[PDB]
C-alpha cells in the first residue's frame, strides 16, 4: 500500500499512472485552463469598451455627500494630554498630511491654476465633460486663509495649549452643484445671520442638551471669514479632466474647552441637495469626541 501506490517497478508507475499519462493530463489541463483564461479576458475587455473615461455611469450611491475631517480618530475621539508631547503626534502628523497639499509652491503659474474671487462667489462652468478643450482649470486655495490653524505659525495647530483645530471637508463629487437654503421664514435659527447665498454653511454644536454649557466658543475659519464653502470651487470635473484640483476647506477651533471630561460635538452642513442618514453617521454631518485631559 504505502510504498506501492508511490512507486512500483513492474508497470513503471508513479503515484498511479505512467510517464505518458501525467503528460497527457498536464497538457490537457494547460490547454483547458488557457482557453478559460482567454475567454474570461475577452469578456472583460468588452466591459472596458462599455465605459467612459470622463464620467461614472452610475452616481446614485454617492448622491448625498459626506463630511470628513483632517484628524484621524480611531473611534471618532480626540484624546490627548497637554503635557506629554508624544500624545497628539498622531493628530498633527495627519493634519499636516492634509494641509501639505495646499502649499503655494504647488499652486503656481497660469497653468493649470487661476486666481478667483477673494470673496465667496457663484459657480463656474468650464464647459462640458469633454477632452475638446484641454485640461480644465481649478481655483487656487491658500493656506493662510485658515488663520490660526495652518501649521505655518504654530506647526502643532493648537494641540499644544488646549485649543485644537479641526479642518472639515466636503466629499468631492463629479458634476455636483452645492445648493444652499434660501432666505425664507423657514430656516434654522443659526443660519439667519450672514446669509451669503454663495456659501454652504457648516455649524457645529453639542449632541446632548447638557454638554452645551461645557463647550465654549466654536471659532470657524474659512474663505471670506465665513463658516462655509464658497460655491466658486464647484463643480468637480473629475481627476482626468482636472488633475491638480483643490477642494475648499473649513477650520474649526474649539477654544475654551472644559478640561478632563469627554465632549460629544456634532458638526453639520445645511443645504437642499444635502440629506442625512441615521445609518451613515458621516453623510452631511460628523461626530467628534474631544477630551483635552491635562
Amino acid at each position: 500500500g504505502w510504498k506501492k501506490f508511490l512507486w512500483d517497478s513492474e508497470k513503471k508507475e508513479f503515484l498511479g499512472r505512467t510517464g505518458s499519462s501525467w503528460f497527457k493530463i498536464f497538457l490537457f489541463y494547460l490547454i483547458f485552463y488557457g482557453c478559460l483564461a482567454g475567454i474570461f479576458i475577452g469578456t472583460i475587455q468588452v466591459l472596458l469598451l462599455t465605459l467612459s473615461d470622463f464620467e461614472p455611469k452610475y452616481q446614485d450611491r454617492v448622491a448625498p455627500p459626506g463630511l470628513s475631517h483632517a484628524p484621524y480618530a480611531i473611534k471618532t475621539e480626540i484624546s490627548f494630554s497637554i503635557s506629554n508631547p508624544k500624545s497628539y503626534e498622531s493628530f498633527v502628523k495627519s493634519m499636516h498630511k492634509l494641509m501639505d497639499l495646499y502649499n503655494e509652491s504647488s499652486q503656481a503659474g497660469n497653468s493649470p491654476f487661476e486666481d478667483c474671487s477673494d470673496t465667496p462667489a457663484d459657480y463656474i462652468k468650464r464647459g462640458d465633460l469633454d477632452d475638446s478643450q484641454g485640461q480644465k482649470k481649478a481655483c487656487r486655495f491658500s493656506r493662510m486663509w485658515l488663520k490660526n490653524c495652518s501649521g505655518l505659525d504654530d506647526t502643532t495647530y493648537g494641540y499644544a495649549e488646549g485649543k485644537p483645530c479641526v479642518v472639515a471637508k466636503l466629499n468631492r463629487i463629479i458634476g455636483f452643484y452645492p445648493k444652499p437654503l434660501k432666505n425664507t421664514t423657514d430656516l434654522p435659527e443659526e443660519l439667519q445671520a450672514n446669509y451669503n447665498q454663495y456659501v454652504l454653511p457648516l455649524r457645529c454644536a453639542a449632541k446632548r442638551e447638557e454638554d452645551r454649557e461645557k463647550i465654549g466658543s466654536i471659532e470657524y475659519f474659512g474663505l471670506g471669514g465665513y463658516a462655509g464653502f464658497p460655491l466658486q470651487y464647484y463643480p468637480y470635473y473629475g481627476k482626468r479632466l482636472q488633475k491638480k484640483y483643490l477642494q475648499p476647506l473649513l477650520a474649526i477651533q474649539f477654544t475654551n474647552l472644559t478640561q478632563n471630561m469627554e465632549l460629544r460635538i456634532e458638526c453639520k452642513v445645511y443645504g437642499e441637495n444635502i440629506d442625512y442618514s441615521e445609518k451613515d453617521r458621516f453623510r452631511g454631518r460628523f461626530e467628534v469626541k474631544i477630551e483635552v485631559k491635562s
Binding site: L36, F40, V62, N171, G238, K239
Partner: protein
C-alpha cells in the same frame, strides 16, 4: 454467553434408555413427578420460557441518529466555527458574528436530520409491533399420577407430558410411548413432511431421531408421552435464538462509501488549509489571522446540505418499496440488494410453499399436469373424460379428511383441513375442479371401511351408488402403486374397460418412475362394481372376512403430489441469474428433494451435471471421474461437517450451481461466512428459526412475512409482508437506480464548492474587496440548491440496469477522482470565473475599474476612512462603498444560480444526451423555476438590505452569467459524445464518474 459453545453443533443424550433417562433426571414413567418436587425444580432453575429481547430505549436511538459519520463531520464543523468566534472575541473589538451564525446553523442541520431519520425507523417499528400476536398456551402434564393442564411457563425438567394432534410440544421431550404420532419439524430442522415420533432410537444425529420432540414444533396427528429433557432457554431453539442475538451487525456498503467520501473531502480540506497557512505567513499576516484563515478554509470545504440531501435521497426509494409490500427496518438496507452478487436461499418456506399439493396425474396412458400455484393462474388439465370423473369419485370418497368448520371465507387452497397431508391435498384438488366434496360425499353413502393397515398397505371402503338406475355397490381402494398393481386385471381406458396386458403394465412402470424421479410421491387408485346378485342391497359386509374381491379390481390411475414452489419463484431466480447474481441453495432438507427443487426453480440449470450423474450415465465408479467436468454440485451436510476452510473456498470457486443439503443452522452460518471470506456481498432469504443465524451474519437478510418465524423476522433487515419473491428483483433494481443518482447529485452539490471558496482565496492573495459574503453562501448551500439535488433522484435509467454485471466493490467506488476532476476541476472553475465576471462588472459600472481594485482591501475595509478615491476621482464614504460590495454579493449569488442551471442539466445524464433521455422529470423543471423565484425574492423584497444585506439589482446585470452557462452546456455535451462514439478511450477513463 460463550459463543464458541453456542457455535458448536448440538449434542444430546438421546442414545440412552428409558431407565437411564429416568435415572438421570429423576422421574416416574407411570406416575410422573410430585407437585412439591415439581415446584422445587420450578424455583430451582427457571420457567420454560425464552428470554425477552434486550429492550432499546428511544433516547438511545435518538442519540444514535444524532451521531454517525456524516453528522459527526458537521459536528466538528460547528465546534470549529465557535472556536474561531471565541478567538475573534478575545483578540479584536467589534468581532463580526458570521462564524457564530454558521455554527448554530450547522448544529440545527444535524439535529433536524436526526429527527427525520429517527422518525422513519420508528414508523417501521410500529407497523412491526402490529405482528407479534402472542396467545398464552397451556400444556398437559401428569403429576402424582393425575392429568393437569398448566401454563407453558410452569413446565419443568422431569415431569411427564402428554401431547395430542393439534397441540404444541412445550419443551424438549424424550418420547416414552407413542400412538401413531407425527410432528412438523419444518421451522427448526426444515423437514417438509411430518416425521413420525417413535419411542425407539434411529439415528446418531438428535435432529433425525424419532425419540425426541422439539420446542415450537406441533403434533399433526396422534398422541404421545414424554419426559422433559430440556427446558427454558437451554432448549435447541433457545440456544439458536441466544446465538442470533449475540452476533454482530456489520457495516453496510453504502456506509463504507460515505466514509471514504468524507476521507477525500477532508484530505483536500486540510490540504488547502495548511497550504494557505504557510502562504499567508509568507505574505506578512500575523499568526492570529492565519489560524482563522485555516479554520475558515477547512470549514468552508464541508458540505452542510449534502447530509439532508442524501437522507432524503435514501428516504424516497424506501417509500416506493413500502408501496409494493417490501418493508425495510433500517434506512440504508435499501441499497444492499442492488450490490448483492451471491444470494443464499432457503428451500422450505422460502423457495417453496410448505404445503403438499397434487402435482401430476396418470390416466388413459397419459401424464396430466395440474396447477400447483397459490393464486391458481395456469393451465387446466382437460376435465372431459369419464376416467377423470371416476378418479374424482375414488379420491373424493376413499378419503376421511374434511375442511375445518367455518372456512366458508378463505380460498380453496389456504383453508384448514383436519387430516394427513395426502388426504388434504387430494381433498383440495377434488374440491378445486369438481366442486363441493361435502355433497359429493353425501351423494354416495359409505357402508364399510377398512382403515389403512401396515400389512395391507392400502385404504378401502364401500359405498352405495348414486346412479338412480343402478342400485349396486361401489368399492374403492387406494394405496401404493406396486401393491395396487398386483390387485388389478382391467384398466379404465377413456371410459371403456380393457385387460391389463404387459403393454400397459410397462407403460405403468415407466409412469411410476417418471413421477418418482420428479421427487414426487405417487399413489394408485382403483375401484370395482360389486355384483348386486352375490351381494344384495341388504347384505352387510362386516369388516372381518373376505367380503370383497381383493384382486380383479379396475385400476383407474396414479396420483402424485409434492410441495410446489411459489408463483414468481422460477421467474425471479431467472431474473437474479440474468443480473449476474450467483444463486446457491442452502437447506436442511433431504438432498433427493433439494436437487429436484433446485432444477425446478433454476438453481441447477437443465443440462448441467453432478459427479454422480456422470458415474450413472457411464456405469463406472465415482472415484474415477474428474470433478472439473461437473458444473453443479450437491454438498451433503454430513460431509460438510468434515471439511477444511480451503475446501469450502474451492467448492464455491469451482462449482457455479451449488446446493447445500442437510445443513444445520450453524452450518448455514458457516456457508455465509465462506462466501464473505472471498469478497462478495451476501443476501440470505429465509423463513424459519434455522435461518436466524444466517440472516443475521449475511450482508442483508430477507425474511418471509406470513410464513416466517418471529425470531428470524426480528433478526432480519428486510421483511416481505406479502411473501412475494419478485420483490427481490424489484429491490435489486431500485438499489442500482438510487446509486447512479447519488453520484449525479453529489457531483452537483460539489460543483458549487469552487465558486464559493475562490472569492476568499483571491481576497487574501490579490487584496480585492470581498466577493462572496457568508449569508449568501448560506443562501446557496442550504436554499436554492436543495430542491434540484433532491430532484436528481427521480431520474430514470439510461441503459438496461438489470443487464450489467454487479459492481466490483474493490474497484468501482461511489466517489472517485474522475468526479473530483469534473466538479472541482472543470465545471466549478467556469462557475467561479462567471461569478468574478459579474463582480468586476458591478464595480466597473459604479466607478471602481479593475486596475484600481488590486491593493485596496486595507482602506476598503478600514472603518474610519471617509474619503476613498476611485478610478475617476470621486470620494466614497465607508457605508457607501459597503453598499456596493453587498450588491456584488447579491449578483454573485444570482450568477451561481444561473450557472447551476446548466450544471443541473449536464448532471441529469452521465453518458447519454439530453435530446435522447429527455426532460420528462417534472421535479427538475420545478427545481429550476423555484430556484430562480427564490433569488428574485431575496433581492427585491423590501427590508432585505436591512435583515440579510442583499440589495436590488439593475436589470442589465442579471445577464452577465448567461454566456458561461451556455459554454458549460456545450462543453459537457461534447464531453458526453466522445464517450459514446469512443468506448474505453481517454475521455472515459479520465472523465466518466
Amino acid at each position: 454467553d460463550l459463543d464458541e459453545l453456542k457455535k458448536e453443533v448440538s449434542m444430546d443424550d438421546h442414545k440412552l434408555s428409558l431407565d437411564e433417562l429416568h435415572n438421570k433426571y429423576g422421574t416416574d414413567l407411570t406416575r410422573g413427578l410430585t407437585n412439591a418436587r415439581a415446584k422445587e425444580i420450578l424455583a430451582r432453575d427457571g420457567p420454560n420460557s425464552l428470554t425477552p429481547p434486550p429492550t432499546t430505549p428511544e433516547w438511545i436511538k435518538f442519540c444514535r441518529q444524532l451521531f454517525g459519520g456524516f453528522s459527526i463531520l458537521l459536528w466538528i464543523g460547528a465546534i470549529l466555527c465557535f472556536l474561531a468566534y471565541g478567538i475573534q472575541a478575545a483578540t479584536e473589538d467589534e468581532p463580526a458574528n458570521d462564524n457564530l451564525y454558521l455554527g448554530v446553523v450547522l448544529s440545527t442541520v444535524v439535529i433536524v436530520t436526526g429527527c427525520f431519520s429517527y422518525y422513519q425507523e420508528a414508523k417501521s417499528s410500529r407497523i412491526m409491533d402490529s405482528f407479534k400476536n402472542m396467545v398464552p398456551q397451556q400444556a398437559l402434564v401428569i403429576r402424582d399420577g393425575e392429568k393437569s393442564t398448566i401454563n407453558a411457563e410452569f413446565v419443568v425438567a422431569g415431569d411427564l407430558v402428554e401431547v395430542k394432534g393439534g397441540d404444541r410440544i412445550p419443551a424438549d421431550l424424550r418420547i416414552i410411548s407413542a400412538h401413531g404420532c407425527k410432528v412438523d419439524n419444518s421451522s427448526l430442522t426444515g423437514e417438509s413432511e411430518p416425521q413420525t415420533r417413535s419411542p425407539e432410537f434411529s439415528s446418531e444425529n438428535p435432529l433425525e431421531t424419532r425419540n425426541i420432540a422439539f420446542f415450537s414444533t406441533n403434533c399433526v396427528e396422534g398422541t404421545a408421552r414424554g419426559v422433559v429433557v430440556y427446558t427454558g432457554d437451554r432448549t435447541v431453539m433457545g440456544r439458536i435464538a441466544t446465538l442470533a442475538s449475540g452476533l454482530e451487525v456489520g457495516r453496510t456498503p453504502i456506509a463504507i462509501e460515505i466514509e471514504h467520501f468524507i476521507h477525500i473531502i477532508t484530505g483536500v480540506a486540510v490540504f488547502l488549509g495548511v497550504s494557505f497557512f504557510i502562504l499567508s505567513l509568507i505574505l506578512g499576516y500575523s499568526w492570529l489571522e492565519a489560524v482563522i484563515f485555516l479554520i475558515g478554509i477547512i470549514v468552508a470545504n464541508v458540505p452542510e446540505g449534502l447530509l439532508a440531501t442524501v437522507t432524503v435521497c435514501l428516504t424516497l426509494t424506501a417509500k416506493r418499496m413500502a408501496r409494493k409490500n417490501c418493508l425495510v427496518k433500517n434506512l440504508e438496507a435499501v441499497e444492499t440488494l442492488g450490490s448483492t452478487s451471491t444470494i443464499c436461499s432457503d428451500k422450505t418456506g422460502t423457495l417453496t410453499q410448505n404445503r403438499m399439493t397434487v402435482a401430476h396425474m396418470w390416466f388413459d396412458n397419459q401424464i396430466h399436469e395440474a396447477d400447483t400455484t397459490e393464486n391458481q393462474s395456469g393451465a387446466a388439465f382437460d376435465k372431459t373424460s369419464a376416467t377423470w370423473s371416476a378418479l374424482s369419485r375414488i379420491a373424493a370418497l376413499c378419503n376421511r379428511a374434511v375442511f375445518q368448520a367455518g372456512q366458508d371465507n378463505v380460498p380453496i387452497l389456504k383453508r384448514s383441513v383436519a387430516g394427513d397431508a395426502s388426504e388434504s391435498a387430494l381433498l383440495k384438488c377434488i374440491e378445486l375442479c369438481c366442486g363441493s366434496v361435502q355433497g359429493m360425499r353425501d351423494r354416495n353413502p359409505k357402508i364399510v371401511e377398512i382403515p389403512f393397515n401396515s400389512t395391507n398397505k392400502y385404504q378401502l371402503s364401500i359405498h352405495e351408488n348414486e346412479k338412480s338406475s343402478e342400485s349396486r355397490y361401489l368399492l374403492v381402494m387406494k394405496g401404493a402403486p406396486e401393491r395396487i398393481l398386483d390387485r388389478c386385471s382391467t384398466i379404465l381406458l377413456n371410459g371403456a374397460e380393457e385387460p391389463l396386458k404387459e403393454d400397459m403394465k410397462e407403460a405403468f412402470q415407466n409412469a411410476y418412475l417418471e413421477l418418482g424421479g420428479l421427487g414426487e410421491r405417487v399413489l394408485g387408485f382403483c375401484h370395482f362394481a360389486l355384483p348386486e346378485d352375490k351381494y344384495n342391497e341388504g347384505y352387510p359386509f362386516d369388516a372381518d372376512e373376505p367380503n370383497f374381491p381383493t384382486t380383479d379390481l379396475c385400476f383407474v390411475g396414479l396420483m402424485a403430489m409434492i410441495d410446489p414452489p411459489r408463483a414468481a419463484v422460477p421467474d425471479a431466480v431467472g431474473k437474479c441469474r440474468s443480473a449476474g447474481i450467483k444463486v446457491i441453495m442452502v437447506t436442511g432438507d433431504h438432498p433427493i428433494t433439494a436437487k429436484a427443487i433446485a432444477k425446478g426453480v433454476g438453481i441447477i440449470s437443465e443440462g448441467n451435471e453432478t459427479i454422480e450423474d456422470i458415474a450413472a450415465r457411464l456405469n463406472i465408479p465415482i472415484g474415477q471421474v474428474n470433478p472439473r467436468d461437473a458444473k453443479a454440485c450437491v454438498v451433503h451436510g454430513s460431509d460438510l461437517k468434515d471439511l477444511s476452510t480451503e475446501v469450502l473456498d474451492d467448492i464455491l470457486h469451482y462449482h457455479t450451481e451449488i446446493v447445500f443439503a442437510r445443513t444445520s443452522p450453524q452450518q448455514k452460518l458457516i456457508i455465509v461466512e465462506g462466501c464473505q471470506r472471498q469478497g462478495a456481498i451476501v443476501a440470505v432469504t429465509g423463513d424459519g428459526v434455522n435461518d436466524s443465524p444466517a440472516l443475521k451474519k449475511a450482508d442483508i437478510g430477507v425474511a418471509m412475512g406470513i410464513s416466517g418465524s418471529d425470531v428470524s423476522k426480528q433478526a432480519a433487515d428486510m421483511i416481505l409482508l406479502d411473501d412475494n419473491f419478485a420483490s427481490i428483483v424489484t429491490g435489486v433494481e431500485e438499489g442500482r437506480l438510487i446509486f447512479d443518482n447519488l453520484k449525479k447529485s453529489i457531483a452537483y452539490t460539489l460543483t458549487s464548492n469552487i465558486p464559493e471558496i475562490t472569492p476568499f482565496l483571491v481576497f487574501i492573495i490579490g487584496n480585492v474587496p470581498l466577493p462572496l459574503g457568508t449569508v449568501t453562501i448560506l443562501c446557496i448551500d442550504l436554499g436554492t440548491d436543495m430542491v434540484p439535488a433532491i430532484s436528481l433522484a427521480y431520474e430514470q435509467a439510461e441503459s438496461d440496469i438489470m443487464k450489467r454485471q454487479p459492481r466490483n466493490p474493490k474497484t468501482d467506488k461511489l466517489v472517485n477522482e474522475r468526479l473530483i476532476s469534473m466538479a472541482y476541476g472543470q465545471i466549478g472553475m467556469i462557475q467561479a470565473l462567471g461569478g468574478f465576471f459579474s463582480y468586476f462588472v458591478i464595480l466597473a459600472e459604479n466607478g471602481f475599474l479593475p486596475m484600481d481594485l488590486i491593493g485596496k482591501r486595507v482602506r476598503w475595509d478600514d472603518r474610519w476612512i471617509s474619503d476613498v478615491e476611485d478610478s475617476f476621482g470621486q470620494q466614497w464614504t465607508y457605508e457607501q462603498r459597503k453598499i456596493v460590495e453587498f450588491t456584488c454579493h447579491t449578483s454573485f449569488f444570482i450568477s451561481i444560480v444561473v450557472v447551476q442551471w446548466a450544471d443541473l442539466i449536464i448532471c441529469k445524464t452521465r453518458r447519454n444526451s439530453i435530446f435522447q433521455q429527455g426532460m420528462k422529470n417534472k421535479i427538475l423543471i420545478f427545481g429550476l423555476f423555484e430556484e430562480t423565484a427564490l433569488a428574485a425574492f431575496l433581492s427585491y423584497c423590501p427590508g432585505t438590505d436591512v435583515a440579510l444585506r442583499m440589495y436590488p439589482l439593475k436589470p442589465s446585470w442579471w445577464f452577465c452569467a448567461f454566456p458561461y452557462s451556455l459554454i458549460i452546456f456545450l462543453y459537457d455535451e461534447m464531453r458526453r459524445f466522445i464517450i459514446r462514439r469512443s468506448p474505453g478511450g481517454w475521455v472515459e477513463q479520465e472523465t466518466y464518474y
